[PDB]
Amino acid sequence: GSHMCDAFVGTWKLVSSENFDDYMKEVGVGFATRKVAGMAKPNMIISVNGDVITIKSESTFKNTEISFILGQEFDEVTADDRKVKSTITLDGGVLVHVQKWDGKSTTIKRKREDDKLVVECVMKGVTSTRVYERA
Structure with missing residues (x-):
């Protein structure tokens, strides 16, 4: 069956960024991290297995991965x-x-x-x- 998350599933690559440095400043990110993170051109990989959605961000700066269920808090x-x-x-x-x-x-x-x-x-x-297109 179709699910609202279907439109997100797949591999995506960053194609444009606006105001990212300012956003990171506001969050409290340090200078050096802002510079290295702002250079990055991550891929974002979204996948679903039953009720569990996994979102990965992969770049030369950092690889991160979160798995979660809609509406359920996580660390x-x-x-x-x-x-x-x-x-x-x-x-x-x-x-x-x-x-x-x-x-x-x-x-x-x-x-x-x-x-x-x-x-x-x-x-x-x-x-x-931040705008991503299919990779």
């Missing part, structure tokens, strides 16, 4: 080494990823738009847009 060590409590839900057809730590919160939304997978990262007033 995540981010690529910038924050230990956060994450919950990922479906809002319509948008995957909405909330990361919480030290009384703060950031929201990463992943949506399909034409043949692209668009990632919007928001911290306080700061929005970064």
Whole structure:
């Protein structure tokens, strides 16, 4: 049967980034990490097995992997080494990823738009847009 996550499954490569340095600043990422992370051109690999969704980010900077069930909180060590409590839900057809730590919160939304997978990262007033195409 078809599932709303089907439109995300596959291998995706980063094709454009907007305001990513500013977003990382707002999150609290250090200078050196921002420079090395901002150079990266990651692939994102999304797969599903039953109710478990796995999202990998793979680049010369870091390889990360999260597996989760929609709506069930999990612990995540981010690529910038924050230990956060994450919950990922479906809002319509948008995957909405909330990361919480030290009384703060950031929201990463992943949506399909034409043949692209668009990632919007928001911290306080700061929005970064990262666009991926199929790899």
